[PDB]
Amino acid sequence: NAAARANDITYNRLIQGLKAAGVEVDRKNLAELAVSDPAAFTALVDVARAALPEDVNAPS
Amino acid sequence: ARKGILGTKLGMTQVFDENNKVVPVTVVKAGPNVVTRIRTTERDGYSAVQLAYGEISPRKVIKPVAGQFAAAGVNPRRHVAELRLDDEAAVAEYEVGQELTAEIFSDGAYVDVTGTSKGKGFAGTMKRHGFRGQGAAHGAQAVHRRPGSIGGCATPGRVFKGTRMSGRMGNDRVTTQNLKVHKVDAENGVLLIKGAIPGRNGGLVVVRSAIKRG
């Protein structure tokens, strides 16, 4: 959550985007990436943002 | 504003006023005081004047105190004390090295004397707090002077900080207010104050103008 908010995204939206994108990396390695490899976490944040729907509050 | 001086309690005696009434007066050796340091808001944050009193041989002062006195510019004295004033205009009339003597007070003035009360040692409640002791007869068993009840029945089950019981008594700074100066003996530097001031004979006292009646 701290690392995601450093990239201007909430933890829950990031998790939903990651699940939609199909990336199956668990929270342990996600935290490891956040601590050790910020560039990989930024790329994952970008793909999660891409995977998210246009209007998160839409009844879809 | 509020004048003041450092003095010594010499004793107590008797005088007769102009109506032939008796006046029990305490003799105070309001000897010469020298201003050693000036406290200002711009430097210390408060306005006060520091006075020195008493005489001691120059070989009795330690190096720091002797250095402070030399920096002030006067010979060291046994006692040093501060008089808290109210503002800078009050402290403007004191400069380092100025000598204060008894005639700053006048006949009929009201003063406040501050001193260390006499020591009474480890004193019980009957003496320390004015407790009334229990009966001395009618079967009372070894409770003629003990305080008795302390708390009560559980509930707080504690003793309520501030409970009055036995302990050390006396030896505390005490101020007596609105004492009338009956006579100012300028040539002896002696103040005749009607009433009783705290402390033993030869103790250090601070005579200040009354805050209520002045």
């Binding site: 701290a2 690392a3 908010r5 450093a6 201007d8 995204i9 909430t10 829950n12 939206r13 342990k28 935290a31 490891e32 956040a34 601590v35 050790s36 910020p38 976490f41 998160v56 | 309520f160 900080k161 501030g162």
Partner: protein, 146 residues
């Protein structure tokens, strides 16, 4: 295993937050988050990895409703009948810093580590602080939209 900070890993930065027209709860929550170090990816509840926080314009804090004259700050000395109560108004007019200090302190753990974290918070009623030598980074309370 999970990463754990070592002796020399922890680094601190200085944040200065302006309290002019800010809701006290919002500012206090942001300051508590900054002090706790929750905003760093290397956060660990064991370690005090927080950042030094400076608060200026403490007297300019914003209090909604009628809490200025109906919210009391209680304190008991321990003696019988030693309870003292002061509304936020007189507390602000007398000790402007204490309101923000209490607000922030109430929001962080009451452990020994919380006592240690309290050492990293400096608040000032004036518009300027003596910590210019540290070159604090201005901090703005923002919300990450989701």
């Amino acid at each position: 295993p999970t990463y754990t900070p070592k002796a020399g890993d922890t680094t601190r930065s200085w944040y200065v937050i302006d309290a002019s027209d800010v809701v006290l709860g919002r500012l206090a929550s942001a300051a508590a988050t900054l002090l706790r170090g929750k905003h760093k990816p290397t956060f660990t509840p064991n370690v005090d990895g927080g950042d030094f926080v400076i608060v200026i314009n403490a007297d300019k804090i914003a209090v909604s409703g009628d809490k200025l004259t109906k919210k009391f700050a209680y304190r008991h000395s321990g003696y019988p009948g030693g309870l003292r109560k002061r509304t936020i108004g007189e507390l602000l007019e007398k000790h402007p810093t204490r309101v923000v200090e209490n607000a922030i302190i109430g929001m962080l753990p009451h452990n020994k580590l919380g006592r240690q974290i309290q050492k990293k918070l400096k608040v000032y009623a004036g518009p300027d602080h003596p910590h210019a030598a540290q070159q604090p980074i201005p901090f703005e309370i923002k919300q990450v939209a989701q």
